[PDB]
Write a protein that binds this ligand. Structure first.
Ligand code: AMP
Ligand code: AMP
Ligand code: MG
Lengths: 290, 294
């Protein structure tokens, strides 16, 4: 698609739905006393996205190598350390994944509504996301006149049982008709692990649409954080100012999640490919024309 | 300042105010039938920010994506015009920008990363946009009195000055802001190719805050005609090559007359909390010429 073809697509209904979704979700959080933060796109530190079942793009800023935002996870933990209590942000992310990830669900630029709550536990956040999704689905039925999944609470699968029964979260999505949780997934250092149990969670949409939200409780203790980083083969100086805050003992227990906005729009409009809900497509492996 | 000093600052009140401002502004637009778009951060093309009397001529930060040069968003102006070309009629976006301005721009009003609420309206004229901004600002200031218990400028509409006359009377827009006690408009400012120019008159506008706080909003009617646009690019010494896909759209006759503006969120927060320096309202400061530690 050249530039003219890109702007010649019909996208009005998807954008109409997107506007209603953003209105609903931002209000959901401000109604519950969340602070609305603005994003950052450049920092000496960012989410490594590893280990996880790709290097961040970099640019020089006044002589210092900065990373483009993979995700604001570390900055959300810092906002909690500043005592903001409950926060969310509409955060753009840049993830330059390969052509292989062009599966209809991935974009190399996207936005997630990313939130964090001081002191929250995994079951708190999951219940909160269930409340958000249930309400959103009921409204979407009014917006679109179509029927959406009806459950107030979603089945919870352990990561292991998903690999056991379906082989992958992929096959799982295709087989289900309700959103479902996958919990206890070994991954990045910031996610809390206790007694071999990872206190984290992914919300998977039915009908093959795949993951829509992901989060967890956080590690906040210096020794434990550095251990997981070293163990993973990550370099500590990639996270220096963060670890300095951790060493100072200023990180606080918290839990949160990110919700992929375009993935949600795609589900509600029922679009075959995520690019169809984006005015300026950002397809993995295909550098954007505009 | 270092990481621990940053996280130790007390900015709860500014963030509480920011939350109320974002709630108010986004509702203002959706209430009026505007569509809410998500931002783009990388693109082959971006706002040149030049010519522009308010800038020094910075080049966008660049990064390769699958081997192809992309520019980090200076502003989404060209993308707003393309959204209008897609028939979305009335649009807004909370758009983060990256502008690596020099230390000379560290005047308390600039940050090298910031967000603007950027909006565009198909068919609108400068008077329509200016009046909509007045409606938004007046209503915001009335709410701010309740949020803070302090007094804010009460004007329902703001006075209008030509740029040329500002220079003559005050010497600069900075001096003008220091002398005024209510917000005011500066219009007819020769600048970038996308602002509409007709027989020597630029159809554009900056909202300036009083008490030295400076500019908080800027916009204009747009050019949409290929030959007019190309001539302005060439006259400024810019390169058609830098705007190739946009110029393809323009050559095809698919740009439409429109007008819009951007409103600096952090600048507005700063004004309402009375902060000396914009860094005081940002959880992670981005001070011009100083690479941030976090
Ligand atoms: N490449 C991508 N394209 C579109 N959406 C994404 C992408 N990666 C993540 N998301 C969304 O953002 C959410 C948070 O992702 P994460 O930061 O990876 O845990 C996911 O649950 C998805 O909804
Ligand atoms: N460097 C900056 N730091 C903070 N806010 C800015 C900066 N540049 C522009 N703004 C705000 O964004 C609005 C739109 O800017 P512009 O795209 O330059 O017309 C301005 O009116 C300011 O309120
Ligand atoms: Mg300007």
């Amino acid at each position: 698609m050249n530039a003219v073809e890109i702007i010649s697509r019909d996208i009005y209904k998807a954008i109409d739905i997107q506007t209603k979704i953003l209105d609903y979700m931002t209000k959901f959080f401000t109604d519950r006393g969340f602070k609305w933060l603005l994003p950052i796109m450049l920092s000496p530190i960012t989410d490594p996205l590893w280990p996880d079942p790709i290097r961040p793009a970099e640019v020089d800023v006044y002589g210092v190598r900065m990373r483009l935002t993979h995700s604001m996870i570390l900055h959300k933990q810092l906002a909690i350390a500043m005592g903001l209590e409950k926060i969310f942000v509409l955060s753009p992310n840049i993830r330059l994944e390969s052509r292989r990830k062009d599966d209809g669900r991935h974009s190399y630029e996207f936005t997630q509504l990313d939130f964090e709550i001081e002191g929250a536990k995994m079951k708190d956040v999951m219940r909160l996301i269930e409340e958000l999704i249930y309400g959103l689905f009921r409204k979407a039925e009014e917006w679109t006149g179509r029927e959406f999944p009806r459950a107030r609470h979603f089945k919870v699968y352990d990561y292991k049982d998903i690999l056991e029964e379906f082989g992958s979260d992929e096959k799982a999505s295709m087989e289900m008709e309700e959103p479902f949780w996958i919990v206890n997934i070994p991954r990045e250092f910031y996610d809390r692990e206790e007694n071999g149990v990872w206190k984290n969670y992914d919300l998977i949409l039915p009908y093959g649409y795949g993951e829509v939200s992901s989060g967890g409780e956080r590690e906040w203790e210096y020794e434990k954080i550095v251990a997981k980083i070293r163990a993973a083969g990550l370099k500590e100086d990639s996270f220096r100012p963060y670890l300095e805050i951790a060493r100072a003992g200023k990180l606080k227990p918290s839990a949160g999640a990110g919700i992929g906005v375009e993935r949600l729009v795609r589900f509600i409009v029922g679009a075959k490919h995520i690019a169809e809900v984006q005015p300026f497509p950002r397809v993995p492996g295909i550098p954007a024309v505009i």
